[PDB]
Design a protein around this ligand. Structure first.
Ligand SMILES: Cc1cc2nc3c(=O)[nH]c(=O)nc-3n(C[C@H](O)[C@H](O)[C@H](O)COP(=O)(O)O)c2cc1C
Ligand SMILES: Cc1cc2nc3c(=O)[nH]c(=O)nc-3n(C[C@H](O)[C@H](O)[C@H](O)COP(=O)(O)O)c2cc1C
Lengths: 374, 390
């Protein structure tokens, strides 16, 4: 079991119901998007053989919001062979099964749409005849990644206006397919140093067209994606994720003092859209400065994710803020019955980091329920 | 006495000493800038006859930070005839006396440099052959104000690049003169809807040159003033005041959800300058006002925000001002945040010994709004110090 003194959350805000988009959540413990690398290659196909049971376990407490693992909305968005896609018929046939399992449990599923940019593996992309994309040609994540891209004869490529538009069409296509197959909503991944974050952050975007050179310009791609997705599926079925203080992927974080203003701009623009009648279902923030700033800008639901499993005091406190959901990542990997365990203040299984990203049933669906653990 | 149950603050962080700029404060109760209009017209001359005593009284607790009333750095900056300036020999002679009285009391004095813009009285300016200035020709603060300007034949004038540079020169001139006359520092007024704020806020600035059209351009003037003043007198003798949620002067406040970004940007630019070796002594923020209880449910939450975001950006001292007199628990709470100073406005008008009273949890005199801006010693130097109840 994890090393903390467990405390029951059942009489806190974390266990009050809330409406998020179209869904009546019975509580506010959320499963955030978690990359697990169990999808089948080739074809980036969801591995229903193992994945259906994974999402069934974790949606077992009725009225849970589940956000899927990052899912590629197109081939060119991708680059990791064992991450699922949602653009092909054969992918969607498998997703439908997963969604059905979550719905049988009377829980909800939101698909996270994930586009890699410079975090992709350039030799895998090259094999598939695909570009190694980012905001720029020359701002590589690091010298090792640069040497990787050069060795693959797939140098980083700052995307054109036309290729930007093609991405936006791919977000749209993937969002409509997800909803058509039964998903309750989609989440636009704009965090953790992937493609849209690469535009947002000045460390990875010094473009001199309208997509770089200012806070407004750096937010433009993200906001065009939001607007296109909102138009296709409705704001009630759309969410977005940010990581203001993240440095993963060679992003700025707090080391750049202008980082908060970048996020306050983009969230303000989402707020302006909401006042005009198109309010996103929720904004998801990665916890580290602090994320307190959001509450002065966005007047909609907020999901906060990061470090809450070992800190029920801080989860309790943050949930007193208005319309705040509390996400659990690593602890949800390791605890199928996390919601129950949180509600009752039971000990939590320790996670096994060695099986986070392996192509195995082990460390995926064999973590025990509280009863089994005893 | 104010109708509240006072609580003592002397064992809180409010009464822990702190170094601001060159000055060792004994405590964190600050007198913020307070316009009182006792200056002599013509000449915008500090009224030493009364003003020396006013500032002597309120500086009596040793080691208090006093920020002066807003003070014009040149004539063209002004437009209120009973507000002081600090450009002329006559003005400076009286300021010297005022600063010496604060220093005799072992306290410190920072001159707020105040530039009016469209808040000015256009007929007052016209009589002196001065412009009625703002970011734009056409975005007036309201219809009444537009008529006032037109009847005075002094229409609003969006200032040129050369004129922006001449204002910056006047801030510099005034800062150097202020420091020469013995001021401990200066505070750039960039709040409450005055000239600099009119540039910061999109509601009053849609210029299509490098001073409008984006967060960065809207900030340009304020940051030009900061940089010029810092280079002239040093960062340790320079401060700045913002009012992110203010609507005074027909500013946006929280009703515009893009307002926080504007301020996070400017403050981040200051943090950048700090990290490179030039840290402003402090940033002064006006707190959000108490909300209108009659706002409908939705518009209540729309307007709502706090200044807590500053602590995620700026790593230096913060002065927070607004609504603390009647809420010692909140002052106590806000003072436990890093390097935080607490300002008292209306209550320092009314309580010359306000520091002592907050230290020991004594009743506070009521303020009389009728004499906030009257050219009188009455309601200026006649509020009494605490006199024991029998
Ligand atoms: C194995 C693993 C996979 C992850 N995959 C994703 C992903 O697909 N998309 C995403 O936005 N964040 C992802 N994250 C970040 C988590 O959602 C969450 O923000 C992070 O784990 C912090 O939460 P925790 O402290 O409760 O683990 C992942 C984290 C881990 C540990
Ligand atoms: C009569 C009066 C004069 C003021 N003059 C100034 C001024 O010259 N400069 C300034 O930045 N703020 C000025 N303010 C605003 C105060 O500094 C302070 O932000 C405000 O009074 C709220 O604080 P309080 O609730 O303790 O009064 C003034 C306020 C009042 C009531």
């Amino acid at each position: 079991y994890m090393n903390f003194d467990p405390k029951p959350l059942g009489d806190t805000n974390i266990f009050k119901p809330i409406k998020i988009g179209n869904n009546e959540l019975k509580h506010r413990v959320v499963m955030p998007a978690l990359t697990r690398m169990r999808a089948i290659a080739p074809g980036n196909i969801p591995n229903t053989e193992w994945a259906e049971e994974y999402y069934r376990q974790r949606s077992q407490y009725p009225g849970t919001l589940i956000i899927t693992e990052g899912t590629f909305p197109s081939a060119q968005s991708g680059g990791y062979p064992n991450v699922p896609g949602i653009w092909s018929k054969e992918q969607l046939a498998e997703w439908k099964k997963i969604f059905n399992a979550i719905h049988e449990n009377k829980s909800f599923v939101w698909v996270q749409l994930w586009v890699l940019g410079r975090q992709a593996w350039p030799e895998v992309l090259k094999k598939e005849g695909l570009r190694y994309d980012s905001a720029t040609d020359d701002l590589y994540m690091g010298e090792e990644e640069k040497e990787r891209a050069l060795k693959a004869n797939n140098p980083q490529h700052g995307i054109t206006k036309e290729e930007i538009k093609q991405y936006i069409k791919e977000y749209v296509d993937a969002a409509k397919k997800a909803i058509d197959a039964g998903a309750d909503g989609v989440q636009i991944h704009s965090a953790n140093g992937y493609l849209l974050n690469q535009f947002l952050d000045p460390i990875s975007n010094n473009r001199t067209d309208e997509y770089g050179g200012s806070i407004e310009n750096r937010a433009r791609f993200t906001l065009e994606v939001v607007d296109a997705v909102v138009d296709a599926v409705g704001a009630e079925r759309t969410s977005i994720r940010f990581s203001p203080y993240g440095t993963f992927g060679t992003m700025s974080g707090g080391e750049n003092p202008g980082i908060v203003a970048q996020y306050a701009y983009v969230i303000g623009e989402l707020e302006k859209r909401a006042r005009a009648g198109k309010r996103l279902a929720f904004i998801d923030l990665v916890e580290p400065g602090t994320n307190e700033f959001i509450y002065s800008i966005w007047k909609g639901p907020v999901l906060r994710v990061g470090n809450y499993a070992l800190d029920p005091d801080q989860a309790t406190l943050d949930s007193k803020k208005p319309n705040t959901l509390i996400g659990y990542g690593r602890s949800f990997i390791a605890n199928p019955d996390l919601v129950y365990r949180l509600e009752k203040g039971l000990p939590l299984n320790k996670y096994d980091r060695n099986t986070f990203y392996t192509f195995t049933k082990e460390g995926y669906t064999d973590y025990p329920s509280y009863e089994e653990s005893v």
